[PDB]
């Protein structure tokens, strides 16, 4: 049982999100640090900013910056203990898609011979891991002041019983089967990244994609408040 009489397992309808709270500037030792939580999924993101290349100096590109992303899950995430060394295949992909989304809109043009590292550590996974990681990395980058095209927000969506669902939990990704996560920058409506692993029929596709994008826009209407609230309580202390 997933959705009957319009109500889900968590007790929320098909359109609304989870409760997500993002905090900026955790680790003052680093450059940019963000901690976000979407329901019970905890995500932590650290970016060390545009520092020069320390070793292996042949990697540097002459025109644009280089973006390095590494995804590491905690060993105590789910019930079964999993080991991040010798379990690299799932992670290698999750890092390379982050590399794609943050070479998409980070403006590498302004930083020649520059390395930007984005490290994301997940502390407690409860479904929708990828969207939480992308949102944490976006808040972390906008801490450190790397100038980018647009605020980046990601979410997920499923399709059960003729209705689209937004922001799945672990239960709904477990039994259901249709997952579709996307990363979106809302100033131009351009979908930055798609992920979908399903048996979904073609005639429904557009519908769930709209709902997915709609959920992403709701994320953009929430985190923005946090960012503005944060930057407002910067300026009162300055001038």
């Amino acid at each position: 049982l997933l959705s009957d009489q319009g109500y889900r397992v968590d007790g929320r309808r098909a359109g609304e999100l989870r409760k997500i709270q993002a905090r900026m500037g955790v680790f003052a030792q680093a450059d940019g640090s963000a901690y976000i939580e979407q329901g019970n999924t905890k995500a932590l993101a650290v970016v060390y900013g545009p520092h020069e290349i320390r070793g292996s100096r042949a990697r540097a590109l002459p025109d644009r910056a280089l973006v390095n992303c590494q995804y590491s899950s905690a060993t105590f995430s789910t019930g079964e203990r999993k080991r991040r060394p010798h379990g690299d295949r799932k992670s290698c992909e999750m890092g390379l898609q982050l590399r794609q989304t943050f070479e998409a809109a980070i403006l590498t043009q302004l930083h020649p011979r520059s390395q930007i590292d984005i490290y994301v550590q997940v502390l407690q996974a409860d479904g929708g891991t990828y969207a939480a990681c992308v949102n944490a990395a976006t808040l972390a980058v906008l801490d450190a002041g790397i100038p980018m095209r647009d605020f980046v927000c990601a979410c997920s969506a499923g399709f059960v019983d003729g209705t689209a669902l937004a922001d799945l939990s672990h239960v709904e990704e477990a039994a259901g089967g249709p997952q579709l996560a996307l990363a979106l920058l809302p100033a131009s409506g351009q979908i930055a990244l798609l992920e979908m692993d399903a048996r979904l029929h073609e005639d429904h596709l557009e519908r769930v994609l709209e709902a997915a994008a709609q959920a992403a826009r709701d994320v953009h209407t929430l985190l923005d408040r946090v960012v503005r609230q944060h930057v407002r309580e910067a300026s009162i202390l300055l001038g």
Partner: protein, 133 residues
């Protein structure tokens, strides 16, 4: 010899701001009056000035820019700077500050072949120097 532990205190908002500084986040639109030049910390999109880093805005008679709150050090002409030496290359030293690249210090600026092997002696790898830009 005494040690102390405490529960971690939750941060308080602590409020009167009294500030009219105009504030932008990346993605929104700067108000366009015709006769602006350009700015750093922003870009051109769809023939519209779009800010690119969260912070406040600054307006000069021709210049409109966005001032952030936490950046690394940007190269400015007349500034004095402190730096840490990292490597000893052949004609120059590599100096690390909190800039986006490690700064370079040529040997021709340092007031003291005869220079090449003796270069290592009077300026050790890992000390702290102060200089103008």
């Amino acid at each position: 010899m005494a040690m102390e532990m405490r529960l971690p205190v939750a941060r308080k908002p602590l409020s009167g701001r009294d500030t009219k500084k105009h504030l932008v986040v990346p993605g929104d639109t700067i108000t366009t009056d015709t006769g602006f030049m350009r700015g750093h910390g922003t870009y051109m999109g769809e023939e519209k000035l779009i800010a690119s880093v969260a912070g406040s805005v600054e307006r000069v008679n021709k210049l409109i820019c966005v001032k952030a709150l936490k950046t690394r050090y940007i190269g400015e002409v007349g500034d004095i700077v402190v730096g840490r030496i990292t490597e000893v290359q052949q004609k120059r030293w590599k100096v690390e500050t909190n800039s986006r690249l490690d700064s370079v210090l040529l040997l021709s600026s340092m007031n003291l072949a005869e220079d090449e092997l003796a270069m290592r002696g009077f300026l050790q790898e890992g000390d702290l120097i102060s200089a103008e830009v």
